[PDB]
Amino acid sequence: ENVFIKTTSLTYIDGENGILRYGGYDIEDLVEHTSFEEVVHLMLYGDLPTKLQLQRLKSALDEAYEVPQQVIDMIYSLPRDSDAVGMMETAFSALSSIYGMPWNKATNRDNAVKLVARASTVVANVLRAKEGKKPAIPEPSESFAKSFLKASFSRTPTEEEVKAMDAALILYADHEVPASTTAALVTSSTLSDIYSCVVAALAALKGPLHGGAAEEAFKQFVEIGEPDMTESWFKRKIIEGKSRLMGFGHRVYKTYDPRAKIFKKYAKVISERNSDARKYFEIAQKLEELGVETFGAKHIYPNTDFYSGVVFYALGFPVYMFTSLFALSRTLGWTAHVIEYVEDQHRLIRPRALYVGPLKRDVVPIELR
């Protein structure tokens, strides 16, 4: 009910003007001129890092990728058709049991850095389990994005692929206070460890009113199948059937979502080099044109979910991974919000329930019921 649950210095949103900033820096500026590691430092420490700061952060990520074999075994023992976010939830519960530490001002940010690394290991292994491939642990490389793509796919990505993944990680890092962030905050109020805060976030993200938006948008393209079929699909499903166009519209943004233009940019480059990926990009682009022509006068435009799937697909990720890829990115926003909350504004969360149930009554023996 518009209820402000906390203050933040992390993320500024201007819905009327289409502006998204992390720590005062415009999202476009961050994507073009920084890197996910730099944005991790910005969200956790409040500024972009110096060379030496960046170096220490990178070494901390590198040493954190390795998790115990038992975590990997658990991922690989779930049914291969299980929801990927659910597999992440299970892996993060195990990480919580192994690594969880108490809240401590001096080490909270170091603990979050290690968790973000381990999110990379988990997501790469969730993909590989579902695909029936052998496990792989991310290894040091020139960047977090590159290490994640190499672990995921066992081939060296191109620079354009790396840059697209890096962008996606920045783009999805934080936004508003959705149910997943709220669950993390509630969990943090009892001083549950940071890994368990992420477990709760993932539990909420698994729900189909929160998770699955990138999948639902991209599934439109899959159903269309070929670019020359787009107009007909749009005539039948949208114009005649009055379905909403998935990946259009936003509760805050009354303009294009600033993230959507950036996902689009990166989709174009990497989609062209595979004809399947190219086909989906061409279908999305035609739907975007039809959608803005039809709904732009109502202040309904592409949102961040419209082109993110196109990027992930072009990278080699199946559709079943898209919300998990969101989660990979959003671990930064979850951890940064809970650290802000615990360090500044820790109230123990204790709401009430109004009793509207039966008045006093006496137990009757079962034979008399």
Ligand X SMILES: CC(=O)SCCNC(=O)CCNC(=O)[C@H](O)C(C)(C)COP(=O)(O)OP(=O)(O)OC[C@H]1O[C@@H](n2cnc3c(N)ncnc32)[C@H](O)[C@@H]1OP(=O)(O)O
Q: Which residues belong to the annotated binding site for acetyl-CoA?
A: 244-245, 247-248
Q: Choose the contact partner of 97 out of its own copies, ligand X, none; CB within 5 to 8 A by kind.
A: its own copies
Q: Which does 212 bind (CB under 5 to 8 A by kind): its own copies, ligand X, none?
A: ligand X
**Residues 175, 250, 257, 337: which is the catalytic one?**
250
Spatial separation of the C-alpha atoms in residues 45 and 219, rounded to whole Å:
38
Name the binder of 361 from its own copies, ligand X, none, CB < 5-8 A by kind: its own copies
How many chain residues are in contact with its own copies, going by CB under 8 A? 99
Asked whether the CA dihedral 334, 339, 344, 348 is positive or negative, the reply is positive
Q: Specify whether 299 is catalytic.
A: no
Work out which of 157, 227, 249, 309 binds ligand X, going by CB under 6 A. 249
* Phi-psi group of 357: left, alpha or beta (phi > 0 → left; psi -120 to 50 → alpha; rest → beta): beta
Q: Is 83 a residue that touches ligand X (CB under 6 A)?
A: no
DSSP string, 48-77: PPPHHHHHHHHHHHHHHS---HHHHHHHHH
248 binds ligand X (CB under 6 A): yes
199 binds, among ligand X, its own copies, none (CB under 5 to 8 A by kind): its own copies
Burial class, 60, CB count within 10 angstroms (exposed 0-12 / middle 13-18 / buried 19+): middle
Q: How far is CA 206 from the centre of its chain?
A: 12
Our answer to whether residue 250 is catalytic in this structure is: yes
104 binds its own copies (CB under 8 A): no
User: Can residue 101 be called a binding residue for its own copies (CB under 8 A)?
Assistant: no
Q: Which is nearer to ligand X, 161 or 257 (CB)?
A: 257
Among 15, 101, 135, 210, binds its own copies (CB under 8 A): 210
In terms of DSSP bridges, do strands 25-26 and 11-14 run parallel, antiparallel, or are they unpaired?
unpaired
| CB-based closest residue to ligand X | 249
Binding status of residue 309 toward ligand X by CB under 6 A: no
Given a contact cutoff of 8 angstroms between Cβ atoms, the answer to whether 325 and 168 are in contact is yes
Tell which positions 257-296 bind ligand X, by CB under 6 A.
295
**Residues contacting residue 38 through CB under 8 Å, at least 6 positions apart:** 30, 48, 49, 54
Strand partners, 14: 19
Task: Please list the active-site residues.
Answer: 250, 305
> What residues make contact with ligand X under the rule CB under 6 A?
208-210, 212-213, 216-217, 244-251, 295, 298-300, 305
